[PDB]
């Protein structure tokens, strides 16, 4: 298992001092469809955005989705048992 907590990249949403523009931006769809080439060069915004999206979704999967799915699993069984046992007592 992974040994360390999962940090987000460029978590904050602020204007960078060097640029004065938001630290993250969506890459243009055309670039997503194909990616970089020899001559083409990466921009800071897209670079930060990709890693930020990856880390944020990893958080949402690990620390959010599984815990609540487990809680729902337990709750479903508890409610089913209650419903059945009511009739059984009847």
């Amino acid at each position: 298992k992974p040994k360390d907590p999962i940090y987000v990249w460029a978590a904050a949403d602020v204007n960078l001092p060097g640029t004065g523009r938001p630290n993250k931006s969506k890459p243009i769809d055309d670039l997503l469809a194909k990616g970089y080439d020899k001559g083409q060069k990466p921009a800071a915004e897209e670079f930060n955005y990709i890693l930020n999206m990856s880390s944020a979704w990893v958080n949402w999967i690990v620390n959010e989705k599984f815990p609540e799915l487990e809680a729902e699993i337990a709750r479903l069984l508890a409610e089913l048992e209650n419903r059945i046992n009511q009739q059984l007592a009847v």
């Binding site: 243009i28 055309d30 080439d37 020899k38 001559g39 083409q40 060069k41 921009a43």
Partner: protein, 165 residues
Amino acid sequence: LKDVNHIHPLPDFVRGGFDYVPSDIFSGKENFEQTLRILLERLEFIDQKMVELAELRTTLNAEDAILDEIGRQLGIYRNGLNDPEYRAVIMILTGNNSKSGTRADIIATLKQLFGEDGVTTYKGYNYRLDINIFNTCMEVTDILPEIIDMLPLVTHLRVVENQGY
């Protein structure tokens, strides 16, 4: 061997004319010379300013106070541009009138704004074109509108600027 532009300050203007004193009759009298020198030296100042009246009116050296007049004749208004880049836009728009937006052509126009190695251009399959800047000496957002104008009708453009490679 000789400059074609004859508009220059007259070399040694002062000693000329003094050469027309007939036979040194007055030379060494220190009374007539001063009277003549005082009058002639006034023409020196006027003679000098005759050049700047022509030199300074060229678009290369024109100051902002009058550069606006040059731009006004061409329809390129100052808007919010400042002097160093207002000169650039004037050159860019004027140069656009004899262009065809070819790959070799586009490199030439960008050459005057970023030195020799300050710019490079990548090309893409579906109308994609890219511009790279390495040694910008002026703020680019205000120059951007023109950079679009000299491109084909259907170009797809990205702009990225950085210092150095």
